[PDB]
């Protein structure tokens, strides 16, 4: 699925990311405009051999399984199937745990590059939340 970017602000809002380790709303759904352009089945081949999936990029090195990722974590306890869903219940579950695992927002690199710092709430105007 593709969200639009109020929709998406809602959903996340809902599954408790406003504020959540610091973090307020508008920064998540930036991270996901540029991870992933807000589309639940994105997915993207590494060199290593892991693949990131999902709306917010989750990597099957550490956090789900592929069955294809040799030598690889699943720390969320999660097929990285379950990360393409329409329903984002999972991704967010397994986001709040690696934000946890001490890094903050540092795991994505399109959030350190396009959104820390900047006017995050300009990501959540518009949308009646």
Not at 45 to 71: H, K
Request: hydrophobic share 35%; charged share 20%; net charge positive.
């Amino acid at each position: 699925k593709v969200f639009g970017r109020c929709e998406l602000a809602a959903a996340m809002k809902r599954h408790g990311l406003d504020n959540y380790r610091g973090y307020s709303l508008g920064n998540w759904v930036c991270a996901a405009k540029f991870e992933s352009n807000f589309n639940t089945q994105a997915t993207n081949r590494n060199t290593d051999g892991s693949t990131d999936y999902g709306i917010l990029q989750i990597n099957s090195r550490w956090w789900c399984n592929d069955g294809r990722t040799p030598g690889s974590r699943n720390l969320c306890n999660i097929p990285c199937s379950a990360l393409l869903s329409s329903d984002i219940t999972a991704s967010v579950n397994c986001a709040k745990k690696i934000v946890s695992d001490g890094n903050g927002m540092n795991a994505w690199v399109a959030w350190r590059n396009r959104c820390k710092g900047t006017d995050v709430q300009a990501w959540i105007r518009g949308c009646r939340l």
